Design a protein around this ligand. Structure first.
Ligand code: SF4
Ligand SMILES: [Cl-]
Ligand code: NA
Length: 409
């Protein structure tokens, strides 16, 4: 009946049962860091590969890292951002909003439908990975999509509502879901405990690559700072020819839950962006953008970025944006005060700083110090080169992008 019950029923079938399906799971990073708490341990006290082993012991045929999906979201959203910027430089509006939090998307559709054109058309990391698994991977393995089950483990009590949006399906059959069942961190922790699985005592297991070949999770060593930051990095590095360091956002005075940064961008010498800048000098009235120039004509643009945590705080930001008192070009809205590490499906703690501990243990110090870039991932490159085409192209649009419905679904 429940989605947990349905997923477990699929896993309960012997692997040689004629009605057995190919049961896949993907795991969010916020789940990996918090799952140890379900055993009464500290965040990060169990390793990612111990979790992978635990999931394989439940019977999953494939065990994926949602970060693979996030590399797709970075490719698409980075390209989408650069495209909106390019169109506006040469005279899909700006500012652009992120779209990965279903709590934001619900409030958008119900209370701010006039803002729909400003929102990124990207699906979330979990939905992009799911779309890929029941298209590319199904084909590769010679499995009918109807014989694939996709399960995600999320820190979030809203991700099932995201997965359930009707058109997230295979070949216009709304009963053939791209993503079937979402299980929360605590629900998974309970499943393990009910079965006498102690993650902390497991050997290291292995991840599967959603490409269906090669070792590991199909994601390179290192960190990105998350999809919004890496989308900015994608756009910035193409625009300027220079690397964007890890961002450090600053709190906004007088606005709760809002952080910001400004990113100055000079176009690369000889680039189209350099040409556009010189040669061509709604509800959210754009202000034409923030620009600067120098005496010799080396002009640039300043990208103004905001992150809102908490939907109440986001409502106050939107009011100020509509008034023209807050001026931003790219805005992320997340429903949870602490973001996904503090999601509604996470363990409950008496520790007032538990989300800080989760954030700190989210990735190890070795990887924290190393910046990775999604477009350099050979698995991602191969997927675009041999299957998807170009970011924002027809196939990528079909599988990886979405739309919004005024009034909600
Ligand atoms: S911020 Fe909260 S509601 Fe939004 S995706 Fe993350 S866990 Fe879910
Ligand atoms: Cl996601
Ligand atoms: Na593997």
């Amino acid at each position: 009946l429940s989605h947990v019950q349905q997923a477990l029923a699929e896993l309960a079938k012997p692997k040689d049962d004629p009605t057995r399906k190919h049961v896949c799971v993907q795991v969010a990073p916020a789940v990996r860091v918090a799952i140890a708490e379900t055993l009464g341990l500290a965040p990060g006290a169990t390793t990612p590969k111990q979790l992978a082993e635990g999931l394989r012991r439940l019977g999953f045929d494939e065990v994926f890292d949602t970060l693979f999906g996030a590399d797709l979201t970075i490719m698409e959203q980075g390209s989408e951002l650069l495209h909106r910027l390019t169109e506006h430089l040469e005279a899909e509006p700006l500012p652009m909003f992120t779209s990965c939090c279903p709590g934001w998307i619900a409030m958008l559709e119900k209370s701010y439908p006039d803002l729909i054109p400003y929102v990124s058309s990207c699906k979330s990391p979990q939905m992009m990975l799911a779309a890929m698994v029941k298209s590319y991977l199904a084909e590769k393995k010679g499995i009918a999509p109807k014989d694939m089950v996709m399960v995600s483990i999320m820190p979030c009590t809203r991700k099932q509502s995201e997965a359930d949006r009707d058109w997230f399906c295979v070949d216009a059959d709304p009963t053939l879901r791209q993503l079937d069942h979402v299980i929360t961190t605590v629900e998974l922790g309970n499943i393990f405990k009910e079965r006498g699985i102690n993650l902390a005592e497991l050997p290291e297991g292995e991840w599967d690559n959603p490409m269906g070949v090669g070792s590991g999770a199909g994601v390179l060593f290192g960190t990105t700072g998350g999809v919004m930051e890496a989308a900015l990095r994608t756009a910035y590095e193409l625009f300027t020819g220079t690397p964007l360091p890890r961002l450090s956002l600053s709190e906004v005075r007088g606005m709760d839950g809002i952080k910001e940064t400004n990113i100055t961008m000079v176009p690369a010498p000889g680039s189209k962006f350099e040409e556009l800048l010189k040669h061509r000098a709604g509800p959210l009235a754009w202000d034409g953008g923030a620009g600067f120039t120098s005496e010799d004509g080396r002009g640039g643009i300043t990208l103004r970025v905001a992150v809102a945590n908490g939907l109440g705080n986001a409502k106050k930001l939107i009011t100020k944006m509509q008034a023209g008192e807050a001026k931003y070009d790219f805005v992320e809205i997340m429903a949870c005060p602490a973001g996904c590490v503090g999601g509604g499906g996470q363990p409950r703690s008496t520790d007032k700083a538990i989300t800080q501990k989760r954030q700190a243990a989210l990735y190890n110090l070795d990887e924290k110090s190393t910046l990775r870039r999604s477009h350099e991932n050979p698995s991602i490159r191969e997927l675009y080169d041999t299957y998807l085409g170009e970011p924002l192209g027809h196939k990528a649009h079909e599988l990886l992008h979405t739309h919004y419905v005024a009034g909600g679904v």
